[PDB]
Write an enzyme that holds these catalytic residues in place. Structure first.
Site, short mmCIF file in Angstrom:
data_model
loop_
_atom_site.label_atom_id
_atom_site.label_comp_id
_atom_site.label_asym_id
_atom_site.label_seq_id
_atom_site.Cartn_x
_atom_site.Cartn_y
_atom_site.Cartn_z
N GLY A 193 0.79 -1.22 0.00
CA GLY A 193 0.00 0.00 0.00
C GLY A 193 0.83 1.28 0.00
O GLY A 193 1.74 1.42 0.83
N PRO A 194 0.54 2.24 -0.91
CA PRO A 194 1.26 3.51 -1.02
C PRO A 194 0.82 4.53 0.03
O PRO A 194 1.58 4.85 0.95
CB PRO A 194 0.92 3.98 -2.42
CG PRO A 194 -0.47 3.50 -2.61
CD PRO A 194 -0.54 2.15 -1.91
N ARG A 195 -0.41 5.04 -0.14
CA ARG A 195 -0.97 6.02 0.78
C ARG A 195 -2.50 6.08 0.70
O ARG A 195 -3.15 6.60 1.61
CB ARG A 195 -0.39 7.42 0.48
CG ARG A 195 -1.03 8.55 1.29
CD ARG A 195 -0.15 8.94 2.47
NE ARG A 195 -0.77 8.68 3.76
CZ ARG A 195 -0.81 7.48 4.34
NH1 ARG A 195 -0.27 6.43 3.75
NH2 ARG A 195 -1.38 7.35 5.53
N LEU A 196 -3.06 5.56 -0.38
CA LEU A 196 -4.51 5.57 -0.56
C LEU A 196 -5.13 4.18 -0.37
O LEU A 196 -4.50 3.17 -0.68
CB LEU A 196 -4.85 6.12 -1.95
CG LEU A 196 -4.35 7.52 -2.35
CD1 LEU A 196 -4.24 8.44 -1.14
CD2 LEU A 196 -3.01 7.40 -3.06
N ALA A 197 -6.37 4.16 0.14
CA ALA A 197 -7.09 2.91 0.42
C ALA A 197 -7.56 2.15 -0.83
O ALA A 197 -8.23 2.71 -1.69
CB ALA A 197 -8.29 3.20 1.32
#
Length: 117
Positions: free
Chosen positions: A30-34
């Protein structure tokens, strides 16, 4: 037109939003967004594109392409810590499946036959 080429038929740097979604859903990274917000956007781009360009647009996401202006764009599915591009490449062509975006393509259904993965 009748050509799935980056310009009109296919945007410049297609499914950019699908790059960060393919890594999270494919390798769990996961980067930063859901995942859902990511998957909404991503699938939003694949929809915009017409039926017959969708599968090509996905291939470009994985492997890439040279714009008719000599400039290249694509191949966003590049290795990441814990997420090799061969895992991403393996999932990518599934972005059009029912479980996923469920979108008809050139072949006439939510599946890409001519895509590497």
């Amino acid at each position: 037109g009748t050509s799935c080429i980056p310009g009109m038929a296919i945007p410049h740097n297609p499914l950019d939003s699908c790059r960060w979604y393919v890594s999270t859903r494919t390798c769990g990274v996961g980067p930063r967004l859901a995942t859902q917000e990511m998957k909404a956007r991503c699938c939003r781009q694949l929809e915009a594109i017409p039926a017959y360009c969708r599968c090509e647009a996905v291939r470009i996401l994985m492997d890439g392409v040279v714009t008719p202006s000599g400039q290249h764009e694509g191949r966003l599915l590049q290795d990441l810590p814990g997420c090799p591009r061969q895992v991403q490449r393996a999932f990518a062509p599934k972005l059009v499946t029912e479980v996923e975006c469920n979108l008809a393509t050139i072949h006439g259904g939510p599946f890409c036959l001519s895509l590497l993965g």
